[PDB]
Structure 1
Amino acid sequence: KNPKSDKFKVKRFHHIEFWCGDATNVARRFSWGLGMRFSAKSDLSTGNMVHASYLLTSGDLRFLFTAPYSPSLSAGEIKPTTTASIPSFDHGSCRSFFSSHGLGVRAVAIEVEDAESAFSISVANGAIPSSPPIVLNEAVTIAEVKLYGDVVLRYVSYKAEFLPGFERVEDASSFPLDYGIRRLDHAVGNVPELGPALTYVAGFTGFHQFAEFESGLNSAVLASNDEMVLLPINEPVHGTKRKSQIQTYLEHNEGAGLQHLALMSEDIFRTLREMRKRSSIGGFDFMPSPPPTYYQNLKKRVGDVLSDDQIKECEELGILVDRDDQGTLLQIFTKPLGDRPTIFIEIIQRVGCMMYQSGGCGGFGKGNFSELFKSIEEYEK
C-alpha cells in the first residue's frame, strides 16, 4: 500500500556528493573502475578558491567528488563574496567529516519542484536544518537538512548544466567511458537505532514504508510517492554468532552514515564483465562469489525468468538473484570503496513490474541472506 503522503513534490535522485581528502584521485579512480565520464568541474581553473569539485556521470547517475583547498586561498572571502560553487561547503565541516568518517557520502541529493518550499516544509515537520535555501545565479535553488549522522539530504530545484559555476570539462579530458550504469536505484543508511531514524525522516518528508517480501540487521525502506526515491535504513542486531556488519560499520565510521549506493545497470552482465576486468588495475573488487550450489539452486527459484545460459553467466560473474511477487532482482556488492570497511557499492538490475518499470521491482535482496546461508551449508557437503 502506498498512501502517497509526500509533503512536497519530489522528482528523482539527482546526485551523490563524496567528501574527499583529494577529489582528483578519488574521482579518477571511480571513473576508471565504474566507467563514468568526467562531465563538469569547479576548481581553481574555474575561479573557485574554496573547494575542488569534479562531476562524473553515467546515464543519469551523477557522482560529485569534493575536497577543500587551503583556507588561506579564500581567507579574505565572506559568504556574500564567496567563490565556492556550492555555498553549503565549509572547510571546517569538510575536514571534520573526513577526519571523522574517512571517504564517504556527504550528500544524498534529490531533485524537487521547489527547494525553498521543500526546506521550509521539512523543517516545519521536524527536519534539522543544515544549509538554508540559496539561489544560484537566479537559476538553481539548493538547500540541505540532516538525514542521518553527518549525511545531509540535499534538495535541488531548477527554474528551467549541473550547477552554476561548474564548467563542462574539456572534450580531451573527458573520455567517454561507459560500462552500462544508468541511475541510482537506492541509497542506504546505517544507524544505531532504526526506529527513531525512520520516524525522523518519514516525519519530515512524508515518505512511506515500502513493502518488503539473524542476518545481523533490521531494515526498513522509505519511498517517495512514485517510489523512485528509495532510502533504506539498517540497524544492527547484537548478540549474534557472526558479528553484525552494521555494527562494524558504525564502529569504523565513527557512527551513522551512508552504507551503500545501489547503481542500476541496463546490462548487469556487461557492467560486471567490465568492472571485473579492472578490479586489479585500479578499479573495484567484489565480494567473494557464492558457491556453485547457489547457482545450482537458481534453476528452482528463477528458472522461469533466466535461461540456463543467463544463470551460468550469473555464476561466472558472481551475481546474486532474488525475487519478489512482482519482479526479479539481480545484484552484486563491491568490497569497500576506500580504506575503511564502511561504504560499498551495489550493482543491480531489475526484471519485471512493467506498466516504464515501477520502483523497487523485486525488492532489495533480503531473501539472499537465507539462500546464501543454505548455499554455504549445502556446499560444505
Structure 2
Amino acid sequence: KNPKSDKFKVKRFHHIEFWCGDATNVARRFSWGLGMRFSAKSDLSTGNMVHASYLLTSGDLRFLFTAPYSPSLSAGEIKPTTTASIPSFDHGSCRSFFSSHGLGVRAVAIEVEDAESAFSISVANGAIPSSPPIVLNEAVTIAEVKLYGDVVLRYVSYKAEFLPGFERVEDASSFPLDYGIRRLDHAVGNVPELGPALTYVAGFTGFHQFAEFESGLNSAVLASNDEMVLLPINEPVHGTKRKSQIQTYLEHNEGAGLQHLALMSEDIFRTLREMRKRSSIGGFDFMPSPPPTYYQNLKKRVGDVLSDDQIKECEELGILVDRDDQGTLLQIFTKPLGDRPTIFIEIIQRVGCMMYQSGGCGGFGKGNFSELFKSIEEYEK
C-alpha cells in the first residue's frame, strides 16, 4: 500500500554533503576509490573566504565535501555580505559536528518543487528548522530542517550549475573516472529509538512506510510518493549475544547519524572489479566475503535470475544477492569510510520491477541475515 501522502512535491535525491576537516584529501580519496569526477568547486579560488567545497559526480550521484577555513579570513563579513556559497554553513557548527562525530554526512539533500514551501510545510508539521529558505542569485532556493542527530534534510529547488557561486572544474583537473555508479538509492540513519524518529520524519514529510519482504536491530523505511526517495532508519536491539552494531555506531558516532549510503550501479560487476582493484592503493575496502556455501545456496534461490557464470562472478567479487516477491537485489558493503566504525557505503543493483524500474525493487537485503547465518553454519560443518 502507498497512500501517496507527501505533504509537498519531492523529486529525487539531489546530493549528499560530508562535513570534513580537510575537504581536499577526502574528496581526492573518494574520487579515486569510487570513480567519481571532480565537477564543481567553491573555495578561495572562487572568492569563497568561508568554506572549501568540492563536488564529485558519477551519473546523477553528487557528493559534496566541505571544510571550514580559518574564521579570520571572513571575520569582517556578516550574513548579508557573506562570501560563502552555502549560506547555511557555519564555522562553529562544522567544527563541532566534526569534533563530535568525525567524518560523516551533514546533509541529505532532495530536490523539491519549491524549497520555501517545503520548508514552511515541514515546519508547520513539526520539523525542527535548521536553516531558513535562502534564494541564491534569484535562481536556486535552499532550506534545511533537522532529520536525526546532527544530520539535516536539505531542500533544494531550481527556477530553471550545481549552486550559484560554484565554478565548473577545469578539464585538466577533471579526469573522467567512472566505475558505473549512477545514483543514490537510499540513505540510512541510526537512531537510539526508532518509533519517535519515524513519527517525527513521517510527520513532517508525509512520507509513507515502505513494505519489506536476533540480528541486533529493528528498522523501517520511509518513502516519497513515487518511492524514489528512500530513508531507512535503524534502532539497536539490546541484550543479544553479539553486541548490536547499531549500538556500536551510536557509541563511536556520539549519537544518531547517517549509517550508510547505498549507491546504485548500472553494472555492479564492473563497479566492484574497479573498486576492489583500488582497495589497497587509496580506495575503499570491502566487508569479508560470505563462504562458498552461500554461493552454492544462490542456485536454489536466484537460479532463475542469474546464470551459473553470473553466480560465479558474484562469488569472485563477494556480492550478496537477495530477492523478495517483486525483484532481485545485488549488494555489497564497504568497510567504514574513515577512522571511526560509523559510516560505510553499499553498492547495489536491482533487477526487475520494470514498468522505468520502480523504486526499492527487491527490498534492502533483509533476507541476507538468515541466509548469511545459515551459510556460516553450513560452511563450519
Please classify the TM superposition score into its range, dividing by the shorter chain length: over 0.9
Aligned equivalents of 2:366, 2:177: Cα separation in 1: 32
Deviation at 1:302, TM superposition (A): 0.3
Q: Distance in 1 between matches of 2:212 and 2:238?
A: 22
Mapped to 1, the partners of 2:275 and 2:173 lie a distance apart of 21
Deviation per residue, 1:85-135 (Å, 9 max, x gap): 000000000000000000000000000000000000000000000000000
Q: Aligned partners of 1:135 and 1:11: how far apart in 2?
A: 19
Q: Deviations over 1:179-237 (max 9, x none)?
A: 00000000000000000000000000000000000111000000000000000000000
Quote the offset at 1:303 in angstroms. 0.2
Superposition TM-score, scaled by structure 1 size? 1.00
Partners in 1 of 2:242 and 2:294 — Cα distance? 21
Deviations 1:2-46 (A, max 9, x none): 000000000000000000000000000000000000000000000
The one-character-per-residue Cα deviations of 1:259-314 (angstroms, maximum 9, x if unpaired) are: 00000000000000000000000000000000000000000000000000000000
Partner of 1:108: 108
Q: Distance in 1 between matches of 2:215 and 2:310?
A: 28
Counterpart CA distance in 2 for 1:367 and 1:72 is 53
Q: Structure 1, unaligned stretches of length 5 or more?
A: none
Q: 2:23 and 2:366 mapped to 1: Cα distance?
A: 34
Q: What is the CA-CA distance between 1:58 and the residue it aligns to?
A: 0.0
Q: Distance in 1 between matches of 2:45 and 2:285?
A: 33
Instruction: Work out the CA distance in 2 between the residues paired with 1:345 and 1:31.
Output: 14
Cα separation, 1, equivalents of 2:317 and 2:241: 29
Shift of 1:378: 0.3
The alignment covers a number of residue pairs equal to 381
Provide Cα deviations, 1:289-344, integer angstroms capped at 9, x if missing partner. Answer: 00000000000000000000000000000000000100000000000000000000
Distance between the aligned counterparts of 2:372 and 2:185, measured in 1? 23
Alpha-carbon distance, 1:142 to partner: 0.1
Residue pairs, 1:3-14, within 5 angstroms:
3-14=3-14
Looking at structure 2, the residues matched to 306 and 205 of structure 1 have their Cα atoms a distance apart, in angstroms, of 38
Structure 2 counterpart of 1:318: 318
Write the distance in 2 (CA, Å) between the matches of 1:73 and 1:370: 55
TM-aligned CA deviation for residue 239 of structure 1 = 0.2
Describe the SS at the equivalent of 2:251: helix
Residues of 1 paired with 2:326 and 2:374: CA distance? 24
Cα distance in 2 for residues equivalent to 1:329 and 1:37: 26
Secondary structure in 2 matching 1:375:
helix
Instruction: Tell me the equivalent position of 1:81.
Output: 81
Deviations 1:121-180 (A, max 9, x none): 000000000000000000000000000000000000000000000000000000000000
Q: Distance in 1 between matches of 2:217 and 2:360?
A: 20
Give the match's secondary structure for 2:287: coil
Does 2:181 match 1:215? no
Between the aligned partners of 1:276 and 1:213, the Cα distance in structure 2 is 30
For the residue of structure 1 that corresponds to 2:280, the secondary structure is helix
Q: Which residue of 2 aligns with 1:308?
A: 308
Report the 3-state secondary structure (helix = DSSP H, G, I; strand = E; otherwise coil) of the residue aligned with 1:246: helix
Matched residues in 2 for 1:297 and 1:373: separation? 12
The normalised TM-score by structure 2 is 1.00
Q: What stretches of structure 1 move > 3 A for 4+ residues in a row? A: none
CA distance in 2, matches of 1:137, 1:367: 48
Q: Could you tell me the percent identity over the aligned residues?
A: 100
Cα separation, 2, equivalents of 1:329 and 1:368: 10
Q: CA deviation at 1:70?
A: 0.1
Between the aligned partners of 2:260 and 2:344, the Cα distance in structure 1 is 5
